[PDB]
Subunit: 337 residues, 4 copies
């Protein structure tokens, strides 16, 4: 075989980072060179399995404070950035410059539009040439570009299930888009990230919509689909998983059979998608697994699509690794299954 | 004062029945004459506080098997039926005939249409004159008829929050009804009722849509609103509460201010409704309380209304008691607050 | 009647403070004069029902930053301190000095021993005369002293159920104390308090023992019982409630009947205790209620006592109000039930 | 390599059976010959992934009703019985007679004592020679006998963590056994099994002790340890996992270091045990994993051991497969990790 890919995981101490660590550890063609945290992190020097004891005895590497990319970039092939948007914006170009392939899990390179970063992210994007270079890592729809991508912008968790549901229907011309698709989505609390805040504190969670008409995932979905949507996320009191219920109006004459044919053609041979021929998925059946599960129902001109994923897996870390498998010529689900 | 109303609670051993017991026990103008179960119930002779130990030392009355209404109807003023639809269909007329006022919590008398009971309930309704007599117990909108009603058909749990949200908007002419309102609703598991079944068994619950395009609450909502809706319920893994996220298209030119004015005019003086002027409610803040909490947001021609209630309280028992307060001239929230 | 007692609630923005607010609001003989937070609190000026929206429309008073006790002490009869130990140590004497009756919910005055505060609380107690004056607010066992107390040290949540279980057995001479009682206790996360910390963050909670051989509640229990115990608390993933399973060795010849007689004599007429004659309580049946529920089982010389309470109610706010009822001559359960 | 072992899974439709299916499916040296249910099962003909949709696309084999063992025994090497005790008692001998190796997950062959089955299981054991032949599948302590066992009685879920904690301490002479170890254990609801019953129904679960002084796991633990224990199980409201807090008195002079040495010697090289050198495990860190995690603390003559496992994995299916690996010469953790 070729040598294992030397892999750096930046922001490894969060929930998504910990899932990346498990996958890379298990991957026969990738090896962890280092796990990093911010320069002045309270978690510097602690073992990843101290913060994430499910990794105890499996991966016990220290979390190294990184103050300069050049202390870690030498002999690195692959960098996963499991960091926040503004850190990723700063870090990605430096790792590219050092000759690394970068899989960014943040929103920093997902949309080829500088004004987008103003409104929804609060900062002026300084790398418009990287906005053009970045490949959107929705893996089922970007295989050819992923093969040669050195900057991969991994989609948001909610956008992943939303677009897997909607894209083949829209590209197939099945939807009357004058009635904007309505995406109602619920996430477990791990999607807020590892952090002491009031709003993800145990007693503060029940069920509540948030980011109503303001969530940064909405424009990501609309721009990439090329169609306006309603997107309403909800925080539910369980740790893991996203379920989306997506309600649309079909074009005149479009049938259940035609929707089924389009989904089957899109995903029949896609190993991370599980299609329900009849009925709709329950969220627990994908938790801990790297799939997106999709079912649907039709009544006259109305369509409801239901999609689930594990928010940390297909919504984040498993999709990142899937993209890496595609990029490096490995079996698409290697380490994931 | 006048004498306390002699009150019989039929089907007292379920979750809604237990909440009725607490309220009636606490009501200064109502007194429990008996609590009943079916003739051959496995729970016959057991104390209500055996099955519902939150009632321990508060109400410890036995659950009496009832095989004939005439064994319980004498000297009864008020009957609450916390029973299933087919039992309620059988029982309500017999209690009416015995001179009782009947508050039915089931679906058996909610819709003035015999064909409705065929499709969605499976039986031929034998009392079409009682379908015409029944007052729909959506208490904020039926005060005048509730004052003289002897048969009250208490609304379903999901229909209550749906119609409190939609009715004043539709009657106000604010909505472009050619885009059917989309009601996405999540309930805690107590809404399935007290029963050993696989689907409400602990390990079987996560988050899943059900009754997709088939739920019997959909026609209840559509018929009473006089407008077609999309209604998708979801079972979530928490015991109590319903949250609904309702997405609509507004008519051209309708503003946030106009929606606010309509809601304020409808509910400003309604003691069981809590209006959020800005932002949307979280489900835990109504659990254990008799309110329906309503907030909303507008962007251009799109409206999202978010409504919460406790499914066993405003969705069932508290609404029943509210109707009884209206019917008998008691303070609207007596015993509820 | 006499005038309502003017009541100040200090540290009102936490979980226990919010429960105090509900009770005092509802109490016919107590009235809220003000709700306070620390001088530089991020929550200053916000309405209590902003942070605790279950109070929406019921209590909407602002949270006032307090920098000097003398800005709030005038015309106050009763002060509830729902604050941390070091704040309570500072504040209680100042409110006493201003002529107020002080119910302290913290640990600051619970134990008449200065060295106790060194080890387990980290500070040098500056008011040893108040350690002698303070009445331990375990309400079932301190009625006579509560009648004349101006400083009440409300017991910890875990200590309350532990001592209600153990005290009558120990005072009755039923236990072979050479085998230390083993108290295994589980609390919901609200017992950690309202605070953004990693350890009470939603995804961080499952079930784990903590404070093993180090918890400050252990000496509180041992000193007040006059006997050494094993005390092991556990954080469980539910918001509210404490269940304790307490395992002891009985003296030779002590029977189930003798244990029952002792418990019945101690609590038969105590309105906040619910005794199970047979079998053991489930935690959900006391959540939202002000009781401590106690059952037990015996086999030969071994005894298991099981006690539950709502950690914010009988474990905190309801016990405080119960003490206040005793102190001011009100019905013991006034506002609680 | 040798041919894959032909494996039959009996009672495959339950929670433990489903975990066996995943492991065997994944095992490179074992292959599923059939999955069976009882002769008149409501689940006959349904696909295992219909009942357990986490298996969708992975294992979709039908659940075959079995009325005669001889319809399934031909060309079977290994039988896993994930069935109830009385079924296992009936079935095990028939499969032995047919030349199969039987791993029984039930209690039917765990204890070499006929009277044991009378009291705690309700039936007269008809195979006392199989009680003598059976190897108790506590895998860390029975390797030599597991190598040649054709009947393996897999330990109960609670007994597994209890004995892994206690056995090396007792055999090492560290404990003053005149104070019976106190085992307080909490399980998720999957440990009650897949079944529609009131007591495992979603709304019925919170936290409650059960089987107080009566649980059939107590004698299993006492007999195999050769010492009397207190064992109190508790049903908690989460699906998966067992945590046990075990409180003992040490012999005079026994130190933390001596306990550590004994545990390290027992389990340092045991791949399914994870030893915490300091502090105690949290239940979520073993859920979904095949380990038993053990930490402990000492103060003077008192010891607390805390052990966790996933109740369906090390408490059931993973231990069964571990035993099978030992029996057939495969790597001890093959398929588990």
């Amino acid at each position: 075989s070729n040598a294992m890919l030397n892999t750096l995981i930046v922001g490894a101490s969060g929930y998504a980072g910990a899932e990346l660590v498990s996958y890379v550890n298990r991957h026969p063609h990738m090896t962890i060179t280092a796990l990093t945290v911010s320069a002045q992190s309270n978690d510097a020097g602690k073992l990843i399995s101290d913060l994430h004891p499910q990794l105890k005895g499996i991966v016990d590497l220290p979390l190294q404070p990184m103050s300069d990319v050049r202390d870690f970039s030498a002999d690195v092939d692959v960098v996963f950035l499991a960091t926040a948007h503004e850190v990723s914006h700063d870090l990605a170009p430096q790792f590219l410059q050092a000759g690394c392939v970068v899989f960014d899990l943040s929103g920093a390179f997902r949309v080829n539009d500088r004004a987008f970063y103003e409104k929804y992210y609060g900062f002026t994007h300084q790398y418009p040439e990287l906005l053009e270079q970045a490949v959107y890592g929705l893996a089922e729809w970007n295989v050819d570009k992923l093969n040669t991508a050195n900057l991969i912008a991994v989609p948001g968790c909610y956008p992943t299930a939303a677009q897997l549901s909607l894209k083949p229907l829209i590209d197939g011309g099945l939807l009357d888009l004058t009635q904007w698709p309505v995406i109602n989505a619920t996430s477990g609390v791990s999607g807020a990230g590892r952090k002491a805040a009031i709003s993800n504190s145990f007693c503060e969670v029940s069920l509540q919509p948030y980011g109503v008409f303001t969530h940064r995932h909405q424009p990501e979905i609309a721009v990439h689909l090329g169609a306006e949507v309603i997107f309403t996320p909800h925080l539910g009191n369980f740790p893991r998983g996203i379920l989306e219920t997506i309600t649309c109006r079909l074009k005149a004459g479009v049938t259940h059979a035609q929707v089924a044919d389009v989904l089957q053609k899109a995903y029949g041979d896609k190993p991370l998608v599980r299609l329900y021929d009849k009925g709709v998925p329950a969220l627990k059946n994908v938790v801990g697994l790297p799939f997106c599960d999709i079912g649907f129902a039709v009544q006259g001109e109305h369509l409801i699509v239901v999609a689930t994923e594990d928010n940390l897996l297909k919504g984040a870390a498993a999709q990142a690794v899937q993209c890496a498998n595609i990029r490096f010529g490995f079996a698409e689900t290697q380490s994931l299954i």
